[PDB]
């Protein structure tokens, strides 16, 4: 029974996408920067929003060869338009992708980052590095979205816990340390149904995006984004069409689900 809970956060990126690439279109030829891609989770999300160049990255080769295989897949489908897409395989909390691009000029109207930026957490530098990843060919006017674990929702359950870990399951999570918040190199193992992870402070990675001239659009925690974007019936639609409250999810998939945030930065002028 797996699917739900994988299928709900997917409808969360969808209806976060779908968004932001309509506050895009109302500014006025799309181009999008999936950093963290993975195998493709996003490729359908992106065909469906209508854009027209896609750059995938992310520091699996096999994750990347893996999302080029797929994209290729929904190009030989019979009777399809679809986005031009550039591969690349890269660290980038640790190396920049100006270099790595094709177009070494080239510009974004969204950076999505699914999933990904904690990962960067581990150190000033690489945190630092991905949000420059992010946000340096952005557009003015262009977002940077993204999802990623709400570091006061993990610490509280820490703290309510009489152990390192906490979880239902669905979900388990080891924290190295209790008590003791570093704003970089804060280990954590999560499991669900195993990547070291790192907490990510939100107030800092705020301040940390002034430095690449963003400013904040909004912080939601899945809960209450969900709450929210669900008062829409051709959201719910798509829910329904893709599949603590009392509906739609059971209990523990809830509490797995409601340790995210989303998240969304603009690029001033």
């Given at each position: 029974?797996?699917?739900?809970?994988?299928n709900?956060?997917?409808?969360?990126?969808?209806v976060?996408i779908?968004?932001?690439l309509?506050?895009?279109?109302?500014?006025?030829?799309?181009?999008?920067?999936?950093?963290?891609?993975?195998?493709?989770?996003?490729?359908?999300?992106?065909?469906?929003?209508?854009?027209?160049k896609?750059?995938?990255?992310?520091?699996?080769?096999?994750?990347?060869?893996?999302?080029?295989?797929?994209?290729?897949?929904?190009?030989?489908?019979?009777?399809?338009?679809?986005?031009?897409?550039?591969?690349?395989?890269?660290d980038?909390?640790?190396?920049?992708?100006?270099?790595?691009?094709r177009?070494?000029?080239?510009?974004?109207?969204?950076?999505?980052?699914?999933?990904?930026?904690?990962?960067s957490?581990?150190?000033?530098?690489?945190?630092?590095?991905?949000?420059?990843?992010?946000?340096?060919?952005?557009?003015?006017?262009?977002?940077?979205?993204?999802?990623?674990?709400?570091?006061?929702?993990?610490?509280?359950?820490?703290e309510?816990?009489?152990?390192?870990?906490?979880?239902?399951?669905?979900?388990?999570?080891?924290?190295?340390?209790?008590?003791?918040?570093?704003?970089f190199?804060?280990?954590?193992?999560?499991?669900?149904?195993?990547?070291?992870?790192?907490?990510v402070?939100?107030?800092?990675?705020?301040?940390?995006?002034?430095?690449?001239?963003?400013?904040?659009?909004?912080?939601?925690?899945?809960?209450?984004?969900?709450?929210?974007?669900?008062?829409?019936?051709?959201?719910?639609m798509?829910?329904?069409?893709?599949?603590?409250?009392?509906?739609?999810?059971?209990?523990?998939?809830?509490?797995?689900?409601?340790?995210?945030?989303v998240?969304?930065?603009?690029?001033?002028?």
């Amino acid at each position: 029974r797996i699917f739900y809970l994988r299928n709900f956060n997917n409808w969360m990126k969808s209806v976060l996408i779908g968004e932001f690439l309509e506050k895009v279109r109302q500014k006025k030829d799309i181009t999008v920067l999936d950093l963290g891609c993975g195998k493709g989770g996003d490729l359908l999300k992106w065909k469906k929003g209508r854009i027209n160049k896609l750059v995938c990255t992310d520091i699996a080769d096999v994750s990347v060869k893996q999302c080029q295989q797929r994209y290729e897949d929904m190009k030989n489908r019979r009777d399809s338009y679809i986005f031009s897409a550039e591969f690349i395989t890269a660290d980038s909390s640790k190396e920049l992708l100006i270099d790595k691009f094709r177009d070494p000029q080239m510009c974004f109207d969204i950076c999505s980052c699914q999933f990904v930026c904690h990962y960067s957490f581990e150190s000033y530098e690489q945190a630092d590095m991905m949000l420059r990843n992010a946000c340096e060919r952005l557009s003015p006017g262009g977002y940077f979205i993204g999802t990623t674990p709400n570091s006061f929702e993990l610490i509280r359950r820490l703290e309510a816990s009489e152990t390192e870990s906490f979880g239902n399951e669905i979900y388990t999570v080891k924290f190295q340390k209790k008590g003791d918040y570093p704003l970089f190199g804060c280990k954590y193992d999560f499991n669900l149904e195993d990547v070291p992870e790192f907490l990510v402070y939100f107030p800092l990675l705020n301040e940390m995006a002034k430095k690449y001239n963003m400013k904040l659009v909004y912080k939601k925690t899945f809960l209450e984004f969900y709450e929210e974007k669900i008062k829409n019936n051709e959201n719910k639609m798509l829910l329904k069409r893709m599949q603590l409250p009392l509906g739609t999810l059971s209990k523990s998939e809830w509490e797995a689900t409601s340790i995210y945030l989303v998240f969304a930065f603009e690029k001033q002028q």
